[PDB]
Write a protein that binds this ligand. Structure first.
Ligand SMILES: *[C@H](O)[C@H](C[C@@H]1CCNC1=O)NC(=O)[C@H](CC(C)C)NC(=O)OC[C@](C)(O)c1cccc(Cl)c1
Ligand SMILES: *[C@H](O)[C@H](C[C@@H]1CCNC1=O)NC(=O)[C@H](CC(C)C)NC(=O)OC[C@](C)(O)c1cccc(Cl)c1
Ligand SMILES: [Cl-]
Lengths: 296, 297
C-alpha cells in the first residue's frame, strides 16, 4: 500500500510556459491558458500589488507563452479572481475531457509539479482542514496544478500560487478563488491551527488490516465518546456521514467503524509502543476512504 | 519534501493489454515489439512448476491478442528472452519515447506506473532493496507494469513486474527478462535474503532535512571506519569513499562534511529519535538517493 498519484499524461499535454518580464506555468485548455495573475508582478510589485492597475499597463505582447518549442500568440487577456486567462490563437489539440471543481478539505489530489512549463514530478496531496497543502514546490512552480481523474475526465482542483512562512502552500481553484483566507501578496499570513483528518486515518487503518497489519485491533466506543477523545488530540470530529463513507471498508474487513474508532482511541491514548502500521511510525491522514478502495 | 515520481505520460503511451488464453496482463510496446512476462502463457495449473519452453511451443502468433486501447495489433512473431516474451507486431508504436533498457543497482530508485488491462491506474516511487525486492502496490493483473527513470526526454526502463513473494514484497526483472535477485517465475517457496538499510540514502535524506530547516539532530565527528563499525551493528550498508564522493554535492550545499553527518547518524542510531521527527518522519528514511534529494532540492 503506497501513496499513489494518478497517471499524469493527460495533464502533461496541457502545461505551458508563461513569462512576463518572472516566469511560471500555465494550463492550456482549448484556446485558453490559465495561470496565476502575479506573473504580471515585478520583484517589487509583490509586496502589495494593485492587480487591476498592473494588468492595464500590460499588453498581450508582454505575455510570452511557450508550448514546448512552439511559441503561442496571445490575442486576449482577462482577470478572474486571482487567475489570468490568456486567450490564444490555437486550441490545445491535446485537450482532455475536463472539469473545474472546488474540492473540500480532507480530500486528496495529485499534483504535477512543473518548472518552466515542463513537468518534473507527480505526487499525491491532501487539502488540509486549514486549506493549506504540504507540498514540494520551488520557485517557478506557480501554475502547477492539482487534479483527480474520474472516468476519462480530468477534474482540475488546484493551481499553486504561494508558500506561507510555515513552509506549507496555498493556492486557488481554477476560477482563481483561494482555498482558505490567503491573498496573493507577499505579506505575513496565518494559516489556522491544522487538525488531523480523522475519517482518513480510519481509512488508512482499514488499509492496514487489508494488508495484514492487525495488531492494533481490540474494546469499543460511541461516536460521541470517541469525539471527546478526538478533541483532546486535535483530531477532526467524526460525523455519521464519515461512518457511512467508511462503510465499504468496514464490509470488506468485517470490522465495524465504531470498533475501528475504539482501536484508534487506544492508539491515540497509549501511543504506538514502537510498533508500526504499514511501515509508518506515525498515523497517516492523507488517504481518503475513496483512495483506499481505488487502490485495493 | 516528498516521495516524488516522474511524470508518466511517456510510459502511458507504451502500455498495452496482452491476452493468451485466459491469462491477461500488461505489455510494453516500443517500436514494433511488445515486451511482457512469459507467464502470460501459463494456465492456473501451470504456475506451480512451468516448463516455459514446452508451454510456448504450443502457442502460435494468433494465440496472442495484443490491444492498444481500442486498436488490435497483429502479432507476426514471438520469442522468449529469459523470463520475458517479445512479440513482434505489425505496427511500430508512434508514441515510442526515446528509451534505453537498464539494469539498476540495489539502492537506486525508480517510478512505477501500475497498470491493469493495459490501462494506467497510478504512479509511485520505489527503491530496489539491497535484497533485490521492492515494496510496491501491485494487485492481480498488474504484471507487466514497468519501472523507469526519466532523464531529459529519455525513458530508462529498469523493471517489469512478475510476482509477489509470500512476505508481501515484490520481485521482477529488467527488460531483458533477468530477475533482480535469486527469484524464479514459479509459485514455489522463495526467500528474499536479509535486507539492509541503504546508508548513503539515509545520509542524503539527513542532508535534505538540513536543507529544509530540520537541524535538531546535528552535533561531534567520527572516522569512516568508526562509523562503519556502528553501521554493521545496526544492519546498515557499509559506507564507502565512493558514497562519500556521491554525497559531495549535498555536503557542499550545506557546508556539513559527510563525516560530520555520519557522527550525527551514529548518535541517531545509538540513541534513537526520542519521539522527535525529521522531515515529519518518525523513522529514518532510506529510499531517497542523493540524486533524488538534489532533483527535488
Ligand atoms: C511561484 O512559482 C512562487 C512559488 C513559491 C516560492 C518558493 N516556494 C513556493 O512555493 N510563488 C511566489 O513567488 C509568491 C508570489 C506572491 C503571492 C505575489 N510569493 C511567495 O510564495 O512568497 C514566499 C515567502 C517568501 O515564503 C513569503 C514571504 C512573505 C510573505 C508570504 Cl505570505 C510568503
Ligand atoms: C501478475 O499480474 C501477478 C502479480 C502478483 C499477484 C498478486 N500480487 C502480485 O504482485 N503475478 C503472479 O501471479 C505470479 C505468476 C508466477 C510467477 C508464474 N505469481 C505470484 O505472484 O505468486 C504470488 C503468491 C500467490 O503469493 C505465491 C504463492 C506461492 C509461492 C510464491 Cl513464490 C508466491
Ligand atoms: Cl514514519
Amino acid at each position: 500500500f503506497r501513496k499513489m498519484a494518478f497517471p499524469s499524461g493527460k495533464v502533461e499535454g496541457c502545461m505551458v510556459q508563461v513569462t512576463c518580464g518572472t516566469t511560471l506555468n500555465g494550463l492550456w485548455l482549448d484556446d485558453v491558458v490559465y495561470c496565476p495573475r502575479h506573473v504580471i508582478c515585478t520583484s517589487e510589485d509583490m509586496l502589495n500589488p494593485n492587480y487591476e492597475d498592473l494588468l492595464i499597463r500590460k499588453s498581450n505582447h508582454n505575455f510570452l507563452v511557450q508550448a514546448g518549442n512552439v511559441q503561442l500568440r496571445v490575442i486576449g487577456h482577462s482577470m478572474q479572481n486571482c487567475v489570468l486567462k490568456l486567450k490564444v490563437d490555437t486550441a490545445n489539440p491535446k485537450t482532455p475531457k475536463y472539469k473545474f471543481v472546488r474540492i473540500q478539505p480532507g480530500q486528496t489530489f495529485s499534483v504535477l509539479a512543473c518548472y518552466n512549463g515542463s513537468p518534473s514530478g507527480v505526487y499525491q496531496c491532501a487539502m488540509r482542514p486549514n486549506f493549506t497543502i504540504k507540498g514540494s514546490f520551488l520557485n517557478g512552480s506557480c501554475g502547477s496544478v492539482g487534479f483527480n481523474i474520474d472516468y476519462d475526465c480530468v477534474s482540475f482542483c488546484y493551481m499553486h500560487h504561494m508558500e506561507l512562512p510555515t513552509g506549507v502552500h496555498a493556492g486557488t481553484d481554477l476560477e482563481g478563488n483561494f482555498y482558505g483566507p490567503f491573498v496573493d501578496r507577499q505579506t505575513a499570513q496565518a494559516a489556522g491551527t491544522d487538525t488531523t483528518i480523522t475519517v482518513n486515518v480510519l481509512a488508512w487503518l482499514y488499509a492496514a488490516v487489508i494488508n495484514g497489519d492487525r495488531w492494533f485491533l481490540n474494546f469499543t466506543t460511541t461516536l460521541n465518546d470517541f469525539n471527546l477523545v478526538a478533541m483532546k488530540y486535535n483530531y477532526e470530529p467524526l460525523t455519521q456521514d464519515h461512518v457511512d463513507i467508511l462503510g465499504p471498508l468496514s464490509a470488506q474487513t468485517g470490522i465495524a467503524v465504531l470498533d475501528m474508532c475504539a482501536s484508534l482511541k487506544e492508539l491515540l491514548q497509549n501511543g504506538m509502543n514502537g510498533r508500526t502500521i504499514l511501515g509508518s511510525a506515525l498515523l497517516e491522514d492523507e488517504f481518503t476512504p475513496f483512495d483506499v478502495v481505488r487502490q485495493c
